[PDB]
Design a protein around this nucleic acid. Structure first.
Lengths: 170, 204, 108, 145, 154, 131
RNA sequence: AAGGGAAGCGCUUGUGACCAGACUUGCGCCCGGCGGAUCAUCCGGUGUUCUCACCGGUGCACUCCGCCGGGCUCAGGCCAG
RNA sequence: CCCACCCAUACCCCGCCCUCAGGGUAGAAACGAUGCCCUGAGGAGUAGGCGGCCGUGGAGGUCAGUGACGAAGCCUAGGGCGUGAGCCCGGGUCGAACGGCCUCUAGUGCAGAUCUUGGUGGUAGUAGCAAAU
RNA sequence: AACGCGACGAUAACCCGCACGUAGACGUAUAAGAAUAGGCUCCGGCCUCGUAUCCUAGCAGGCGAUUCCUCCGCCGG
């Protein structure tokens, strides 16, 4: 490049490490109900939409049912339930568009005088919204077909006395 | 099976002293609060003459100077006998052992705060489940009474009064069971056969 | 009103360290997880995250709660007791103390 | 510098505007410093909130204190505040003033006054108006105030 | 950082020093500890009573069993004596301190002994060695707590 | 990117000092390590529960040796001549002004090192900022 | 701060108190203007290793540097998943 | 008699330190050939032998070395370096000299010696008012 | 018991100032007695098994309805 090596900084030898497609567990299928265990939505029942790369998953609540918007989740941090809601009617093109990483990725007087102040809670964009709706209309339309599934997704999971996860069948 | 409780109440009737005390000590070191009732109803294997012989040897053990400091204090109360056993099995000279001893409480009879509570049993220490049918056994309360315990009769009348009140409580429990079962049938007469079959299918 | 629980963990007790008869190793701790009594259950609970929560009598981030994190790694013995390794060894007076075993990472 | 928290027997200041006591400023530099502090503080104190902010200047050492009033009668064991060169002031014959420091202790000593916002900002041929110097302070009787 | 508690105002304070005094250091320390933290009049009357054999100074650190009387009840200590020269020189030194405070213009009614320190002095090279002492005591007017004005909303 | 070079992580085998035996109980014994010579001393015999002895095994890695936690090696500097000596190798060494250096020479070392990209461990010894 | 018939020391946390302060955090490219220069087959002077330097004087057609005002990119220290 | 389990500095895998052994290294090296790189082995230790390195007083040379805007010394619930003896810096005090390296030199490194001198404790405000004072 | 306990009598509330908010809870729910070569019962029947029962849904759990008189809690008799 522009500068000739200034010091004896040695280049690293070639690293023989390739990136290969991630293989999710068999329980993870599009439409599986998942149990968020960590984060600000810990203990919450959501629905899986699409499996992303490197262990990431795209889920929704849906928002109108429980309160979880379109978000990413860690497969190791989420528990899969055997119940699988049908995903017919959901736009796969919209699923891909929302699954693109950039969607969730992204000195003056105002800066100097806001220095130190706690930033205000900015509102939700109509695009993140209106896409939440473009998915949830069909998804809840699917939900009302299955009996009590709406209440199941609305309620929050918890462990009771005597409940032993190593024997409990999720 | 491996359950954690706020406090465990153990009815001491029919339990072997050493086995029950060892289990209690292990539970205390694990951090489970344990309280033991009917220490006068505790049981010791062997024969009563063997028990009297050993505890009289313990009485024979005394310090030479004034028996006020460093001398073996012979506590003749059955609860204190159980306490001596658990203390011998507890590292009583360390802070952890002191914490376990503070977590442990032992009583004679069943005061109201624990008679209005549930009592657990330990199968590994039950006399019936542990000792051979032909073997003989003795009572901690009888030993304590014949060595010097003064309040065997006091706990006797208090226990009898508790028996009377518990019998009355059971009678009211019978009446409650009457009403509960009749309500079960009467409600099941119109219990939405669909939901009833749902419960049947799922196993409740 | 929900009137329900918020528990997403399994209770356990830090009991002691990995020790012989007269030699202890604080770097590793022994945990008795509630409800598990067999090596198969311990194998299920292998590789798990662990939190020890305690009070501090002083606020640093607006709270007096402090959490020491660790992991259940491999089972101990045959009674379902498991062995855990933390970033910092558990204090010492936590022998017999309540500990939280999380449900992540999950293989289900 | 000492905080009120560390000050024993202290208190908080209240929201009221306190009055300033600018003591023993005599040279033109002292008048300049005094007027700068007067500009810094409000013109009309809320005398209902009985708070005093005092900057007392002796031997170029400006002393900052903050107290609050109690005008009380003199106790039998107390004195009457005697006058300097004219002792025993006339008119206040049985009344004292109670002071409880409710502000930090700092001592300020002026080192530099400039024309604009610092040396970088003072541009003309009189960029610096005054600078404290050890040659100026060599003699103990020479006070710049 | 942290700030140490600032000293009380010098013109609310009075200081007194006595160096190279020819009284036993242990006795002076015991008397100073007995009279520490008290009212000025209380301390003076206490020391006058000590001279008049009326009230006894209890020994705590440098305690040698000499007297076991009823005068030790008020301190809870079973060992009490009467240091005469100690009481007399300390009376002199608090009188000097009171005169200094009066000169400074303090309220005589409210002097209290915040501080009294007794240290050892260079030994009198005469084997029998004397033990002289240094005594420094710091007095103040009682701390004053004053009213608040009610905060005005705006 | 202004830091030390890529380096092997600094691993310290032992962080606590080696203390002389019985230096706790006798004040006349300084804490500096002195190897005991008693034929029956427990520390020399290396019994359990006794003070450890220094060893080339405790000796540290050569790649991470003499390196500060920031990753630079301390260079004792007395003047701008020493700073110009550090010119070519600032990613290896950090300037440490000598204690006996005067205020203006400290200022010159700091200014030249800042112009030169050389980190100084003590840049706040006898100086202050003026606007 | 601690102290129920010793203290003191070792390994390992925890609590409190005080003290310190992490990578020293930038290069590159592209536009428009401005000024300097191995730029000019420019002029003059000086010292020299006699072929290399350093000054004084003109300019900005080309070339190279900067400074300003834009624009884009990249790289980074530690710790976790 | 049978199954599982617990842990030594014991055995296995890996990282690091040093010593040893072997190999490579010039129309010279991308690191003082007394230098650099690679590989394998080993690691207790009394009497004793060998090497290296830390430190003190003074002398020659050198660092166009530090310094009255602060040398040396000392104190310090601070930041580092070295396995270690030790070295550097920060904060306070302080006031006139001092240090790094290459050598040269020696009255050169302390816990003991019922060690020397000096100073200071418990005994103890005790024993006793005894010579001295 | 001078670091075991009980009953009783008599007290210390105001003014000004100033200082801070768990040897281990997270559903920390569950009372017959008695025997174990017997016991329970509803008098039909039932008992290896607490592997049970109770409770368990809603922003760390909102608003308004729909609709229920079921539980919970506070105070009085």
């Amino acid at each position: 490049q522009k500068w000739y090596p200034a010091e004896d900084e040695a280049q690293p030898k070639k690293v023989r490490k390739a990136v290969r497609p991630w293989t999710p567990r068999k329980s993870l299928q599009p439409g599986t109900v998942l149990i968020l265990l960590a984060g600000r939505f810990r203990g919450k029942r959501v629905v899986l939409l699409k499996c992303l790369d490197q262990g990431v998953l795209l889920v929704t609540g849906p928002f109108k049912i429980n309160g979880v918007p379109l978000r990413r989740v860690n497969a190791r941090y989420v528990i899969a339930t055997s119940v699988k809601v049908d995903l017919t009617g959901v736009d796969q093109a919209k699923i891909d568009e929302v699954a693109q990483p950039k969607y969730f990725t992204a000195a003056s007087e105002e800066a100097f005088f806001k220095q130190g102040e706690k930033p205000q809670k900015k509102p939700v964009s109509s695009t993140r919204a209106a896409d939440q709706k473009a998915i949830d209309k069909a998804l809840i339309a699917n939900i009302k077909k299955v009996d009590m599934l709406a209440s199941y997704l609305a309620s929050s999971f918890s462990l009771r006395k005597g409940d032993k996860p190593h024997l409990m069948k999720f | 099976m491996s359950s954690f409780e706020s406090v465990v109440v153990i009815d001491g009737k029919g339990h072997l002293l050493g086995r029950l005390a060892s289990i209690v000590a292990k539970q205390l070191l694990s951090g489970q609060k344990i309280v033991v009732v009917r220490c006068e109803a505790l049981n010791i294997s062997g024969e009563f003459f063997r028990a009297k012989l050993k505890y009289h040897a313990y009485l024979r053990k005394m310090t030479r100077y004034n028996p006020t400091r460093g001398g073996p204090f012979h506590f003749r109360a059955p609860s204190r006998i159980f306490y001596k056993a658990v203390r011998g099995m507890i590292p009583h000279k360390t802070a952890r052992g002191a914490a376990a001893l503070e977590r442990l409480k032992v009583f004679e009879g069943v005061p109201p705060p624990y008679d209005k509570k549930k009592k657990m049993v330990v199968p590994q220490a039950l006399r019936v489940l542990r000792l051979q049918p032909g073997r003989k056994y003795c009572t901690v309360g009888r030993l304590s009474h014949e060595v010097g315990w003064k309040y065997q009769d006091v706990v006797a009348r208090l226990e009898e009064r508790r028996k009377a009140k518990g019998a009355a409580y059971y009678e009211r429990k019978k009446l409650a069971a009457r009403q509960l079962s009749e309500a079960k049938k009467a409600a099941a007469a119109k219990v939405d056969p669909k939901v009833s079959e749902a419960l049947a299918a799922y196993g409740y | 009103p929900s009137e329900a629980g918020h528990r997403l963990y399994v209770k356990g007790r830090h009991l002691s360290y990995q020790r012989g008869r007269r030699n202890t190793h604080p770097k590793t701790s022994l945990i008795k997880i509630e409800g598990v009594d067999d090596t198969a259950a311990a194998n299920f609970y292998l590789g798990k995250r662990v939190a020890y929560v305690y009070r501090a009598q002083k606020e640093v981030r607006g709270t007096k709660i402090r959490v020491i994190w660790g992991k259940i790694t491999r089972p101990h013995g045959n009674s379902g007791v498991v062995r855990a390794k933390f970033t910092h060894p558990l204090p010492a007076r936590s022998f017999g103390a309540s500990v939280r075993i999380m449900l992540y990472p999950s293989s289900i | 510098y000492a905080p009120g928290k560390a000050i024993p027997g202290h208190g908080r200041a209240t929201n009221h505007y306190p009055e300033l006591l600018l003591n023993n400023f005599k040279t033109p530099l002292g008048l300049l410093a005094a007027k700068s502090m007067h500009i810094l503080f409000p013109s009309k104190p809320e005398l209902a909130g009985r708070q005093v902010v005092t900057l007392h200047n002796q031997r170029d050492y400006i002393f900052f204190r903050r107290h609050r009033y109690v005008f009380r009668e003199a106790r039998p064991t107390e004195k009457n505040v005697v006058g300097a060169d004219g002792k025993e002031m006339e008119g206040v014959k049985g009344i004292r003033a109670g002071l409880q420091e409710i502000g930090p202790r700092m001592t300020l000593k002026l080192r530099r006054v400039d024309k604009g916002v610092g040396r970088a900002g003072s541009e003309g041929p009189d960029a610096v108006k005054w600078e404290w110097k050890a040659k100026m302070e060599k003699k103990r009787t020479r006070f710049n105030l | 950082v942290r700030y140490a508690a600032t000293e009380i105002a010098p013109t609310k304070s009075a200081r007194a020093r006595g160096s190279y005094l020819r009284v036993s250091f242990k006795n002076t320390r015991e008397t100073a500890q007995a009279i520490n933290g008290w009212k000025l009049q209380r301390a003076l009357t206490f020391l006058q009573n000590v001279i008049d054999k009326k009230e006894a100074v209890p020994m705590r650190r440098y305690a040698g069993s000499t007297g076991r009387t009823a005068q030790g009840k008020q301190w809870g200590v079973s060992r009490a004596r009467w240091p005469v020269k100690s009481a007399q020189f300390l009376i002199g030194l608090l009188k000097n301190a009171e005169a200094n405070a009066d000169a400074k213009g303090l309220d005589t009614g409210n002097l209290i002994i915040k501080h009294i320190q007794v240290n050892q002095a260079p030994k009198q090279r005469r084997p029998y060695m004397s033990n002289p002492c240094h005594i420094e005591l710091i007095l103040t007017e009682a701390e004053e707590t004053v009213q608040k004005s009610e905060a005005v909303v705006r | 990117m202004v830091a030390a070079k890529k380096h092997v992580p600094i691993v310290k085998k032992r962080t606590k000092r080696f203390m002389r035996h019985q230096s706790d109980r006798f004040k006349c014994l300084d804490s500096a390590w002195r190897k005991p010579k008693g034929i029956d001393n427990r520390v020399r015999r290396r019994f359990k529960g006794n003070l450890a002895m220094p060893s080339i095994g405790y000796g540290s890695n050569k790649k991470t040796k003499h390196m500060m936690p920031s990753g630079h090696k301390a260079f004792l500097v007395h003047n701008v001549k020493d700073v110009e000596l550090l010119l070519m190798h600032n990613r290896t060494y950090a300037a440490e002004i000598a204690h006996n250096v005067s205020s203006r020479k400290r200022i010159d070392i700091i200014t030249r090192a800042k112009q030169l990209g050389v980190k100084v461990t003590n840049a706040k010894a006898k100086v202050t900022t003026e606007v």
